[PDB]
C-alpha cells in the first residue's frame, strides 16, 4: 500500500473552496485562511496498521489506527462524529467520517500513493475538500 514515510506539501489550493462550498456568506476565504507556514505530515505504518500525524509547527493530533477500524471525534456544532479508514485499490485508502446522523454534507479523507513518492491526500468536511499532493521527505 505504501504511505509509510514523511510527506512534504505539494500542490494545495482548496482551503477557500472549503469556506466557499460550506455556504459562502461573508466568509469569503474567511479573510484569514490561506497559508502562513508549511503544513507537513508524517505517516508511520506496518502492513494494515497506520499512523498519521498532520502537524505544521505547534501541537497537533494524529490517528494511530489500523485500516479496518474507526476512530471517534466531534464536529464543530450539532452532533458528535466518528471516522473509519478503508481502501480503494491498494495504495488508495479512504476515511469516511460521519456524525452518526449527518444533516447535509459530511467529513472524510482518502490518502493515495503514486509511482513511489507522490502521496495525494484529500479530506472533505461539510462539503469542503482539502486535496493536496505530497512527496516523501
Q: Which DSSP category does 31 fall into?
A: G
Separation of alpha carbons 24 and 19, rounded Å:
6
Closest CA relative to residue 15, chosen from 133, 119, 128, 122: 128
Nearest to 21 by CA among 136, 124, 135: 124
Written as nine digits, the cell of 91 is 495504495
Neighbours of 46 (CB within 10 A): 9
Q: Is 133 annotated as a binding residue?
A: yes
Burial class (CB in 10 A: 0-12, 13-18, 19+), 38: exposed
Is residue 132 a known part of a binding site?
yes
Class of domain 1-137: mainly beta
Amino acid at each position: 500500500p505504501n504511505f509509510s514515510g514523511n510527506w512534504k506539501i505539494i500542490r494545495s489550493e482548496n482551503f477557500e473552496e472549503l469556506l466557499k462550498v460550506l455556504g459562502v456568506n461573508v466568509m469569503l476565504r474567511k479573510i484569514a485562511v490561506a497559508a502562513a507556514s508549511k503544513p507537513a505530515v508524517e505517516i508511520k505504518q506496518e502492513g494494515d496498521t497506520f499512523y498519521i500525524k498532520t502537524s505544521t509547527t505547534v501541537r497537533t493530533t494524529e490517528i494511530n489506527f489500523k485500516v479496518g477500524e474507526e476512530f471517534e471525534e466531534q464536529t464543530v456544532d450539532g452532533r458528535p462524529c466518528k471516522s473509519l479508514v478503508k481502501w480503494e485499490s491498494e495504495n488508495k485508502m479512504v476515511c469516511e467520517q460521519k456524525l452518526l446522523k449527518g444533516e447535509g454534507p459530511k467529513t472524510s479523507w482518502t490518502r493515495e500513493l503514486t509511482n513511489d513518492g507522490e502521496l495525494i491526500l484529500t479530506m472533505t468536511a461539510d462539503d469542503v475538500v482539502c486535496t493536496r499532493v505530497y512527496v516523501r521527505e
